[PDB]
Design a protein around this ligand. Structure first.
Ligand SMILES: CC(=O)N[C@@H]1[C@@H](OC2O[C@H](CO)[C@H](O)[C@H](O)[C@H]2O)[C@H](O)[C@@H](CO)O[C@H]1O
Ligand SMILES: CC(=O)N[C@H]1[C@H]([C@H](O)[C@H](O)CO)O[C@@](O)(C(=O)O)C[C@@H]1O
Ligand SMILES: CC(=O)N[C@H]1[C@H]([C@H](O)[C@H](O)CO)O[C@@](O)(C(=O)O)C[C@@H]1O
Ligand SMILES: *[C@@H]1O[C@H](CO)[C@@H](O)[C@H](O)[C@H]1NC(C)=O
Ligand SMILES: *[C@@H]1O[C@H](CO)[C@@H](O)[C@H](O)[C@H]1NC(C)=O
Ligand SMILES: *[C@@H]1O[C@H](CO)[C@@H](O)[C@H](O)[C@H]1NC(C)=O
Ligand SMILES: *[C@@H]1O[C@H](CO)[C@@H](O)[C@H](O)[C@H]1NC(C)=O
Ligand SMILES: *[C@@H]1O[C@H](CO)[C@@H](O)[C@H](O)[C@H]1NC(C)=O
Ligand SMILES: *[C@@H]1O[C@H](CO)[C@@H](O)[C@H](O)[C@H]1NC(C)=O
Ligand SMILES: *[C@@H]1O[C@H](CO)[C@@H](O)[C@H](O)[C@H]1NC(C)=O
Ligand SMILES: *[C@@H]1O[C@H](CO)[C@@H](O)[C@H](O)[C@H]1NC(C)=O
Ligand SMILES: *[C@@H]1O[C@H](CO)[C@@H](O)[C@H](O)[C@H]1NC(C)=O
Lengths: 325, 170, 170, 325, 170, 325
């Protein structure tokens, strides 16, 4: 007798899926939706190389710590790599005010161009050339100072006069710039450097003003210094003008950066990982993913076009049927 | 399966049916073999492919966590940020993990249904010109050559012709 | 359909059945026509309506984005706010778009099942007083006038009457 | 032979839905859950009209810029409409401290009542009747000042004495009020207006204190002024008392607002759109929705009772079956 | 149910069947009773239990709201925190409430299917050695003692043996 | 004739569930996933008792308000219970700067050890033994002062000299400590207490500096005082050293806390509820849950291992079938 039978496919698959009803069900075909592989390195994104700060922090880079000269000048970057043990940051002890908001502003950019904003001749009747300190050396000169700032002191002869400077930002780009106020450990050093009298630093713009006075006091020694500097930063917008006025204690702006903002989102990765000559479309803090999968369990932090981060080990979707060979 | 066919009143599948997911095995005087039903297989390939691509497509956005730092006087917003970032991670992890669980259940049912419906189609044509035999197989009460086999598969069987032999063989 | 009926061992619907979702077509000596099954149509309208209203009801909350401004020294919280607001927008957009996809699949299956169950009910009354045919139609082994037709539809057929007539004929 | 058949409905529908399994499936009946229509205008909410600041910003309104007189006095509002090109704000250059937190507090309210908090006679031995400036004109007088503040200067004859004022908030409503501190461009103007000597403005309450000193410096010209004013605001709570003390540089509070908070949430819409005589229950930044639908893709920003915002173009749910005519 | 059996072409359940979810009621000369089908009941208990535990497992995370305070100059982040906390509460409330609604629908369908499949299994063994009454009951065209009853339940009936006896009786 | 019938279970259940298709469906078996019961009390967590601040606020406790002596010394806690009507906080009117961030830091800890950080003898040439006030009494002495601070005044005889103090945190734990600056109502009191001359308080650390000057002004009377104190707090990290320098107006640190941080998350509950000798694994602001259920509608605020909070009244999942007896 003739048979006709109805039936279904089987094969040699041992791949399994879960359902609400049943765990470890072997199926003929399935697709894994989650990526768990990464190359442990940093690559170019959109063909642009990241910026390796090497043995400098963001602070050291952007203030011009003399041991950060290899970074000096123009930079372009897809993202920034700060090495977690970098030694060269703020050499002369003090606080950089609004540091976290600075680290965020810098991260939102893609290029800086360094330029002289105030030449030293700006400041009349003062010494611009002995503003240097052993807290803050080069690899060759063991007494130096930040390359983007000038520590102004009075001339031997004289009084510290009122000094003034103005800069009109007639460009198309916003300018990131820096200054400070010196806080000597005691009165003697105050008088040496700046003379006697109530001292001030004042600055202003069509939209900001600033005014600080020295706070003389001995604080705990850091790189041999019981004095301090308070560092400050700001952004002179296109069309704005800056006026600087001081009669003492000014750590003046010298060089600043024309800053260009990213329409994208930017990143600052604190990592040990090597930077290699490779391209990539997705870069996570812990490595690059090269994948077409729609999920990943590597890292929530990245730039580029990455898959959605989830905590799963696996996300395997059945396509075929239950395999019974 | 919920439709009862796959593993199964039809226990077991066929490694020998290479060209489809669902189909037929026959035996008669001219020989024997395996042959997929192309229409129902293909229509399932299109459906499952669309399901996979729809899931891929709807999951195609990303919550973007951020590397910003916080001072020792910003413990509150620092923690707001952390609680938020973990919050979305937990929501998406749930959505994906449950979706996969639910969809895999419903995919097995779909295959199960397609097998069952195939079986039922054959059953309606054959009626009492064959004996069921309970494993999704039918023994004809008559001589069924290859043309008659193709007849059953393409949906044009012709019970009246065969009712003859079938009855007296019964 | 997964139940096998809509498009279909019953290929094609009926533009001529105007008054319901599922029902009957008959032909006899007095003529021919179409008539909905009110009980099953209505019971589906109640189910689908409840489904729609349950979805509307569960979706009846709103994430409220906010017009607050942030200074040039609040880039971090400004962005926390943005990342959060887009985060919930993405979650809800996913929930809605996928729900609709899933529920539409399951709603077609439901209609498919209700048609198949109607077919099965009629099949149980008629038994061997009619011949199945496989396209959802039944050919009577006997004379079935309009009163007999209404009989089938209202669930009061009377196999015993007919039976003798049907057996001679079969 | 007589036939009874089982079957299903079809019709002339060409409306389609998507499912996980299949796209563009024509169905007999369906319901759209998403609204994409809006009327491009602003309407009343809860029968209350919104407040049109017209050619004024929030700052200009609430400080009493002389060109913002049409807004002067009591206001009630369902929400606020600030026009994006409004010209009349801070006329005399300076910063309104905690501006964003002010824009947020004002938005959370529904009425203000304007009242004289400190009459000019409060301030003994000074001139309260000049205090006016060409940076800050009416439509008729081209040298004026904010209507809610008094710029106090010394009398020709004399010294600027210590001046004092007190206000006990004996009402049930919190009071929103304003003051400033003048920062002259140079010493000459300082001496003209206030005399010589270290100057101060101090203010206080059971729960706040404030103390500022003038910071004399030339800053870039804005509406002809190289001086500045630092503006300040606060909220005197019910039962609290305010003491003001100054010997110079005070821009004194004159008029303030009894402020009434909304139990609701409030809104500030920056928009060009017209305000018409219409009612509405849902108002988005980009228009009113009149709908019963549970989703919408117009805007995430609104007041009233709106549908959930999503990014979809469409959310059509099948109700009938597959249409095969 | 969607499979059409529970409430039902089988209207009503059995308070007298104490030991399972699905099974059999018989009557013959030796007496009458109720008896679960252990295999199908158990396989459904394992599936439902897995479903419950999977839901429990995937819901096993918590969004943690926080008691931090905010000053009168922190109205914006205060409200960012509130909007966030309510946001996740609304997302999880939706996920839980809808899941329950959906899964309960699908759980009833599963039971409905398992009853239908049981009925169909018995129907295939018996064939025309019994008559369909209606509520899922079969009248034998022959004498079916307890051993013959167990025969039907365990899937080993033996149509050939009662066929001659069954054909007389008809 | 012999019957065999196929069928399904029924029982005496009246419990119902909802489905998308149908409401109030009676089922044979079901499981409730949501907890709505709580014990209205506070219990130990991880065997550690919570800290009951009783009639004190966090401020009063941690500054050493003299009416908060019962809390004085070492404390260990699983969480903190602040009673909503507590009366004893800041006794001498003024602001505790960064209060919310202090309330947050304290909540993240699990123990403090109180110790003398600066003995009174630290401060040379001044009176450390008056420094007391009727705004700020014990239960026995109606003129006292915070137990963790010293109000220094000059000796009758003399000038208020420059005073100095240093503390090197050589331990393994961070130290939470406190200071203030006195703001007298007028010049007479300034001269009485501290002498004439520009006065300052300056403090510093390897990573922070502070400098404030007195702001003399009469502010509204609070507990009989028209003067004020600005309170401050900070955290000296392990290895860091603190230098204090002042010539007037210093409310000096005396006692401080070695602070030990929780690896967990911590809580501060503002509640009336009783604390009993009971153990618990989940504690909500409104009560303890003892449950295995995966959802709850008691509260979103807790410590320990609680179920997910949702707004539902019920979450009942069908397990059995429709009950038709
Ligand atoms: C001169 C006089 O009696 N003035 C009172 C003072 O009462 C009190 O304040 C003084 C300090 O001036 C001190 O603190 C004393 O303990 C307290 O009772 C006040 O000086 C002043 C408001 O502080 O009110 C005056 O009436
Ligand atoms: C007297 C007065 O209130 N305002 C005057 C202002 C300012 O006081 C100072 O110039 C500060 O820049 O100066 C002038 C000007 O050129 O704008 C004229 C104006 O009369
Ligand atoms: C001298 C001193 O330290 N305290 C005295 C104070 C303060 O002089 C004022 O409170 C400053 O406003 O006045 C009184 C008080 O407050 O109890 C008496 C107390 O002996
Ligand atoms: C399994 O089967 C495939 C066909 O899909 C075959 O080509 C392959 O070599 C086999 N693999 C193993 C491991 O047997
Ligand atoms: C499947 O189940 C087996 C137990 O036989 C287990 O070892 C394996 O980890 C499971 N696979 C997955 C993906 O969970
Ligand atoms: C503090 O720590 C140790 C004390 O032994 C020492 O190495 C260091 O110099 C000290 N620093 C100061 C400023 O006292
Ligand atoms: C569909 O059918 C009805 C006729 O009864 C008619 O009103 C409507 O215009 C038709 N629609 C189309 C697109 O033909
Ligand atoms: C449906 O598919 C058609 C193609 O025939 C396409 O034009 C249309 O945009 C689709 N509609 C939706 C809602 O995707
Ligand atoms: C404010 O006024 C009321 C009396 O109407 C009084 O209780 C209180 O003393 C006043 N407060 C001040 C600080 O003057
Ligand atoms: C800066 O830029 C241009 C110069 O052409 C001009 O509009 C403006 O006067 C300048 N600003 C100032 C404050 O000098
Ligand atoms: C409930 O059902 C049980 C069977 O388990 C039965 O004994 C009892 O009588 C029933 N209760 C009532 C009130 O009928
Ligand atoms: C279920 O429906 C009944 C109406 O029979 C109603 O009384 C009850 O409140 C409902 N229960 C729930 C949980 O909604």
């Amino acid at each position: 007798s003739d048979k006709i039978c109805i039936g279904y496919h089987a094969n040699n698959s041992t791949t399994q899926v879960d359902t609400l009803l049943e765990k470890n069900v072997t199926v003929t075909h399935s697709v894994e939706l989650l990526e768990n592989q990464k190359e442990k390195r940093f690559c170019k994104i959109m063909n642009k190389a990241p910026l390796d700060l090497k043995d400098c922090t963001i602070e050291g880079w952007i203030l011009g710590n003399p041991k950060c000269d290899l970074l000096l000048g123009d930079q372009s970057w897809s993202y920034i790599v700060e090495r977690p043990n970098a030694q060269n940051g703020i050499c002369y002890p003090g606080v950089l005010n609004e540091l976290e908001e600075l680290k965020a502003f810098i991260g939102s950019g893609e290029r800086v161009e360094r330029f002289e904003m105030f030449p030293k001749s700006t400041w009349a009747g003062v010494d611009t050339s002995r503003g240097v300190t052993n807290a803050c050396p080069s690899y060759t000169i063991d007494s130096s100072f930040y390359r983007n700032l000038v520590w102004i002191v009075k001339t031997d002869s004289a009084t510290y006069p009122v000094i003034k400077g103005t800069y009109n930002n007639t460009g198309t780009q916003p300018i990131l710039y820096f200054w400070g106020v010196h806080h000597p450990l005691d009165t003697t050093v105050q008088d040496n450097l700046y003379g006697s009298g109530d001292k001030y630093v004042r600055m202003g713009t069509e939209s900001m003003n600033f005014a600080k006075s020295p706070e003389i006091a001995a604080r705990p020694a850091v790189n041999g210094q019981r004095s301090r500097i308070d560092y400050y930063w700001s952004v002179l917008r296109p069309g704005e003008t800056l006026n600087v006025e001081s009669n003492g204690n000014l750590i003046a702006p010298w060089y600043a950066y024309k800053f260009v903002s990213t329409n994208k989102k930017g990143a600052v990765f604190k990592s040990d990982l090597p930077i290699e000559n490779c391209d990539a479309t997705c870069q996570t803090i812990t490595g690059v993913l090269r994948t077409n999968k729609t999920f990943q369990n590597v890292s929530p932090l990245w730039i580029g076009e990455c898959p959605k981060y989830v905590k799963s080990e696996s996300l395997r979707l059945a396509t075929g049927l239950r395999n019974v060979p | 399966g919920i439709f009862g066919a796959i593993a199964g009143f039809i226990e077991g599948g066929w490694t020998g049916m290479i060209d489809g997911w669902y189909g037929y095995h026959h035996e008669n005087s001219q020989g024997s073999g395996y042959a997929a039903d192309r229409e129902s297989t293909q229509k399932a390939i299109d459906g499952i492919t669309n399901k996979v691509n729809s899931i891929i497509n709807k999951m195609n956005t990303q919550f973007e966590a951020v590397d910003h730092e916080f001072s020792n006087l910003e413990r509150r917003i620092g923690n707001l940020n952390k609680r938020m970032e973990d919050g979305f991670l937990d929501v998406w992890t749930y959505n994906a993990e449950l979706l996969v669980l639910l969809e895999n259940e419903r995919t097995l049912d779909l295959h199960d249904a397609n097998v069952k419906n195939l079986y039922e189609k054959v059953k309606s044509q054959l009626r009492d010109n064959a004996n069921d035999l309970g494993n999704g197989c039918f023994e004809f009460w008559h001589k069924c050559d290859n043309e008659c086999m193709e007849s059953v598969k393409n949906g044009t069987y012709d019970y009246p012709k065969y009712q003859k032999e079938s009855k007296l063989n019964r």
